[PDB]
Amino acid sequence: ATIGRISTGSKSLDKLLGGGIETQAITEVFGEFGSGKTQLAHTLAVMVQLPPEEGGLNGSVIWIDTENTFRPERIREIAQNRGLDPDEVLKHIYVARAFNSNHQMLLVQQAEDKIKELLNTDRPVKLLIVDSLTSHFRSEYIGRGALAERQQKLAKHLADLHRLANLYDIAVFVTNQVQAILAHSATLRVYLRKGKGGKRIARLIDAPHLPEGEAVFSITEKGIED
Ligand SMILES: Nc1ncnc2c1ncn2[C@@H]1O[C@H](COP(=O)(O)OP(=O)(O)NP(=O)(O)O)[C@@H](O)[C@H]1O
Ligand SMILES: [Mg+2]
């Protein structure tokens, strides 16, 4: 029942997060296009595989991809440059493409099967990524009355995700795109934005009991880092 933390690769962002993203929680990253949401997801999918003294949880990953932006070679590069075996690392990421929102919801039920299978093995699932949490919902639920219906379906989907996080001690990491779609209650919302000089800036939103500064990071051949 203790909480585990997965390093993001950035010391700056890790400090903002209290050491990394938490198990038994849904962390939502949100921001405009190009703000680094997907690159952070890729980095986390490598970092979680590290031992705990290196910031990981010796864990496997389930990834629900909605817009086909998962890149196996980016995983390999990030792994390679952090001293891990690129091919081994891919072996422990289980990617499924969600065709629509209803399929996305079914894939969360299927994730529980994979989770159970690995639970008391040496590489339990420790990270579940949904990229994008909201893209299908934005496309499908549109027009008069759609706000209530969309928020309703999303809340149920997030409830499924919360259950998996808490029941199996897993960090859930979801993405959400904004044009400068309420994610019910993610545990923690992190706003990402592009800054000058190729830097990215992160800020915690509506978290008055947590740090109020901003983290600054780059996107490199190691994925995310200061
Ligand atoms: N291999 C790489 N090495 C370094 N930087 C990279 C690499 N791949 C992507 N990037 C950077 O990452 C940016 C895209 O980040 P990404 O994480 O895809 O944004 P995003 O928030 O997911 N965009 P969107 O899905 O449209 O809402 C690119 O514009 C590059 O600046
Ligand atoms: Mg993306």
UniProtKB/Swiss-Prot annotation:
Domain of life per record: Archaea
Encoding gene per record: radA
Chain residues that bind ATP: 31-38
Record keyword Nucleotide-binding present: yes
Function as written in the Swiss-Prot or TrEMBL entry: Involved in DNA repair and in homologous recombination. Binds and assemble on single-stranded DNA to form a nucleoprotein filament. Hydrolyzes ATP in a ssDNA-dependent manner and promotes DNA strand exchange between homologous DNA molecules.
Protein name per its UniProtKB record: DNA repair and recombination protein RadA
GO biological process: DNA recombination; DNA repair
Keywords annotated in UniProt: ATP-binding, DNA damage, DNA recombination, DNA-binding, Nucleotide-binding
Phylogenetic lineage: Archaea, Methanobacteriati, Methanobacteriota, Thermococci, Thermococcales
Keyword Mitochondrion: no
Organism this protein belongs to: Pyrococcus furiosus (strain ATCC 43587 / DSM 3638 / JCM 8422 / Vc1)
One Gene Ontology MF term: ATP hydrolysis activity
Family: Belongs to the eukaryotic RecA-like protein family.
